Amino acid sequence: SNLIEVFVDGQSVMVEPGTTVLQACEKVGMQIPRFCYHERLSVAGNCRMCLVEIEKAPKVVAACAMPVMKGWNILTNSEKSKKAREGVMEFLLANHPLDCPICDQGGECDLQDQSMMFGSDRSRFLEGKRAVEDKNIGPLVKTIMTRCIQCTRCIRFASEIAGVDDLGTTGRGNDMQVGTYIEKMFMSELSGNIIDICPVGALTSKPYAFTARPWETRKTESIDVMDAVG
Amino acid sequence: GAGGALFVHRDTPENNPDTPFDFTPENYKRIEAIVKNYPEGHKAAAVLPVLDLAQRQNGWLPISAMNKVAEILQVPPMRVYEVATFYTMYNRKPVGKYHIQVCTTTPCMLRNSDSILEAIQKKLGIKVGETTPDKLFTLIEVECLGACVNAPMVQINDNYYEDLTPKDIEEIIDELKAGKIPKPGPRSGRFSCEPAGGLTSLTEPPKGPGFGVQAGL
Amino acid sequence: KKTSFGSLKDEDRIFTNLYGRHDWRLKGAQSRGDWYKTKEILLKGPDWILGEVKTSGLRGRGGAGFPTGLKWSFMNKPSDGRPKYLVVNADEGEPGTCKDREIIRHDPHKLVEGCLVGGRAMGARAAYIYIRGEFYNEASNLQVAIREAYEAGLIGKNACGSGYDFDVFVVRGAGAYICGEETALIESIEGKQGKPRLKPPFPADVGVFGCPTTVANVETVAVSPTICRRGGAWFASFGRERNSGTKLFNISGHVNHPCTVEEEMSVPLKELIEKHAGGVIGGWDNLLAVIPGGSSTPLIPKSVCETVLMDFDALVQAQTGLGTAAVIVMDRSTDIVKAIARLIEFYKHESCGQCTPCREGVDWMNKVMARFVKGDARPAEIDSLWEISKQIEGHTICALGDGAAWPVQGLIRHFRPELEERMQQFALQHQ
Amino acid sequence: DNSTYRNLQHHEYSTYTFLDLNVELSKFRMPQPSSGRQSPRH
Amino acid sequence: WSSTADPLSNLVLTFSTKEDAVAFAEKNGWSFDVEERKVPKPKSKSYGANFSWNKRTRVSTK
Amino acid sequence: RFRGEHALRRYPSGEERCIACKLCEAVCPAQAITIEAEPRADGSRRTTRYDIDMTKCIY
């Protein structure tokens, strides 16, 4: 058909036109690190965690947003892409708070897991961290914006999936904040899912607060019966 | 340095959603023209101008003004909130009728722009970001203003006062206090960022139309 | 064949009304040769105009330096169904730069004519001018020039006896340096906050309102009609190969006569300062450092600026780049670390902050420079700072991160001994 | 000639001059193109 | 504390393929229920769809 | 360094240091620690149950 042949670490794969680098890497069998990309949301290209090296290309590209073209060789484990991941995680963790023991997302945090796998193990940040005031968007979602990494994933989910446009970004630069800018409650029948999409503990479940840790829990796959959707 | 301006809004008797704000009919005509500029179906592209107009009618931007602009343009109010909190020329707090802005970036800082700021400090008796008790002047330190070559310079309500000295800014402040409007532009007998005594370019009378048109045209 | 540049005759310049000594309205523009035989140029077709621009060797004056003929040719694709727009970048945010403001306040009709000619070559339906919000009086002057053109029939209904319809719109920003970036500028025009968007898609395919678009500097579009009228070869005579043309220079800082001046491209920096600027304060030996192209370009010391040319390639050879041709000079009686720290603070204030590298790393670099200014750090940190810059550079969405990383890199590379001495002094005095 | 400054006029600009001129120009301009719908939210 | 009575509460076995697991279950004499693997279907992602001229994929902010 | 009987400490103000992070429960080789937590009256992250089986502990 109209499939184009690309290479991931020298292994050929046939992909449709318009496919991104991240999706081709998925097809070969690799998961590119990500913080702002969600397959169910629109592409943002903010966190810059998915930076990967194309062979014979002097600049790293964003895998989640860069469509792939015929003949590229994607070098996911090259020293350039590894250094890019380490630098991006260093920048992400520079202003993050030391709240892991008191965070509800201890053993199920993408920031922690991707720092363990794709980041360094020590800091060279000798400054004072920032702190922002917590918002209050209702009794269902507990808000601690000091843990926010500004991936703008909740904003996209609210605007597109939930059709509710009260979330947004106020400010410019390092003191840019996510919220409503007013005392407003983010109320919708799909409001709890911002807890799931948020990779960090900035948004958590208030009724679940402090109750358990992920490794303790046993998971049973079952069916909802609150309505006829099942 | 840290900004200090909050990016969250708390209801105030002065700044609450019930605060009366509306556009005068002339501002309605201006809004109509502004929307007429942009293609059909993309009225949101008029958020920045119309909001500015609201400020020019009120002097600052309460939450009521943001809500009114959002209602007029049929856009979610949060979008107007982001636009207002992103751009620095939007005043989300009341300011004095004369808004003094001093440029202290490296090209201005090199030509002793701190002296002019300190002269303003002494003449007004207020700190860098405060407001005079009579609500006449508001001092703010800003970034580059596009007049680097003719530094140091200040901006007071859409006017540029350039090539300043402490004496010059003292005179401008006292003249603004008196009531009359000072003449904008560089001081020290200079017009339009020309060399002070060089005049190394643009000395001959300019040539007329079609001086060097090539053949075939 | 020519080896020495820097003697540009008065009659051979472009912006003859740079200093505002003549009338800036339609009558003055007619007296100076503007709006002359514009109808013939419009009728000669877009292909001829693009060919003239390509043979002219013009490069973008916004700072990127990309050849404008190639960009406009990329814009020259056939129709799609959507309208096509031309955007002129009059944001003028980068510190040390004052030329776009002058050419828009004192000679706007060249800008209007260039907008019309560029739109004709580009197939553009209309032109949007994104002027800096702080520029109010000159925005009004440009609006008056546009009204005079509209009344005379120079733009709008057939714009000439040519049959081509073109509109020119003026849009004012609101205090945001990042809005000068082409994608951020498009975002701001579209009524959103000025955050640059990723590429692809490029503006030539998806731009303003989702329509094909190309963003150009004021100087580029302003010189395009004169290039077309006098021919590409005449412009290509000046400067070196791949560096042809005349350039507007702003000279600021520690000079006797800071000024703006149009000069041949590859003029040596020293004679440029000594001729038009009146020389460094206290003589040439007093010079300490110079930033040749605005805050984004790295600084260079006296030793290399003694015998350096002023164009894209020769400045890249000096590891700096021409940028926007904004010369900022500093003599030996100043704190260079303080100046670079101020520039980094400006970049910290003016980053939109949507991508993690620029936001976080630029705040980090601002803090590290603030600590360096008083010497509170230790030398082992200097290399660390270098590493931090290399993490910002090339990993961000737009070039603001690059433009914030480069000044730190230049300062470190050329005055590491100054930082080390300051650290030693602080350590000794505080014990 | 070049000795005299010919740009003393920007001394007499009001706070509504830009918008007034936009209103004046509004009726010299051609109809805008359309995307077929009132907004992306429609 | 939480007390239990069956021995097989914490017993979870890992298998490479479905057929291997089913063979193990049949060999050990256990009645089994199998449900098929769920894979996320591929999706057409495009950044340029955000800035749409006439479609509804036009994002309000970013 | 000698390690004998266990104890739960508190801050000089007199308010207990334990924040119910459950790391001690997860690291315990003998599974001798049982923890249950909930938000307090002031919203503090505190344990409502913290048991150590000293017949299971290996010290």
Ligand SMILES: Cc1cc2nc3c(=O)[nH]c(=O)nc-3n(C[C@H](O)[C@H](O)[C@H](O)COP(=O)(O)O)c2cc1C
């Ligand atoms: C942070 C930033 C600010 C910029 N500001 C301006 C500006 O004020 N004026 C300008 O012409 N270009 C500016 N640029 C460069 C633009 O990308 C450039 O104008 C655009 O590519 C078109 O320029 P050209 O006419 O040289 O092709 C800026 C770039 C960045 C990254």
Ligand code: SF4
């Ligand atoms: S969000 Fe993740 S990394 Fe941040 S404090 Fe919570 S658990 Fe730790």
Ligand code: SF4
């Ligand atoms: S709150 Fe969570 S999902 Fe929303 S922007 Fe911050 S980190 Fe992303």
Ligand code: SF4
């Ligand atoms: S580099 Fe800075 S200004 Fe540019 S998009 Fe990223 S955060 Fe914004």
Ligand code: SF4
């Ligand atoms: S739960 Fe255990 S590890 Fe966590 S604070 Fe309490 S005693 Fe310490």
Ligand code: FES
């Ligand atoms: S996942 Fe691609 S930049 Fe965030």
Ligand code: FES
């Ligand atoms: S540095 Fe002062 S106007 Fe730019």
Ligand SMILES: [Mg+2]
């Ligand atoms: Mg979460």
